Amino acid sequence: QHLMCEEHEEEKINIYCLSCEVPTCSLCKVFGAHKDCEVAPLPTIYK
Amino acid sequence: QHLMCEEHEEEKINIYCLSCEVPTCSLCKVFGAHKDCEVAPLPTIYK
Numbered sequence: 001q002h003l004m005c006e007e008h009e010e011e012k013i014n015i016y017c018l019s020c021e022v023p024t025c026s027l028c029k030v031f032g033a034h035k036d037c038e039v040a041p042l043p044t045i046y047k
Numbered sequence: 048q049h050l051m052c053e054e055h056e057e058e059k060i061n062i063y064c065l066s067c068e069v070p071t072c073s074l075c076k077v078f079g080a081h082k083d084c085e086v087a088p089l090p091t092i093y094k
């Protein structure tokens with residue numbers, strides 16, 4: 001059971017943007033809207 | 048900037064289901080699919 005990113009439709013929402021205060025996907029951080037934001041892992045990252 | 052629940056379309060995704068490993072909304076925990084799950088707050092809850 002996963003949430004998928006609205007923009008990156010094949011990516012799982014697995015991180016949290018601490019700057020915007022919104023869960024996001026890895027590609028949103030690598031290339032996308034949160035590229036310069038501080039992020040945290042969601043538990044799924046280290047399970 | 049917020050993610051909204053797919054089922055509870057007026058609710059913000061502001062909690063994390065630790066049991067299912069998926070971000071969710073409060074109503075999913077109070078009444079919905081994650082009612083018997085263990086949950087955690089997302090940072091937005093205590094900002």
Ligand SMILES: [Zn+2]
Nearest residue numbers: 005008025028
């Ligand atoms: Zn994305």
Ligand SMILES: [Zn+2]
Nearest residue numbers: 017020034037
């Ligand atoms: Zn951001």
Ligand SMILES: [Zn+2]
Nearest residue numbers: 052055072075
């Ligand atoms: Zn919900």
Ligand SMILES: [Zn+2]
Nearest residue numbers: 064067081084
């Ligand atoms: Zn659950």
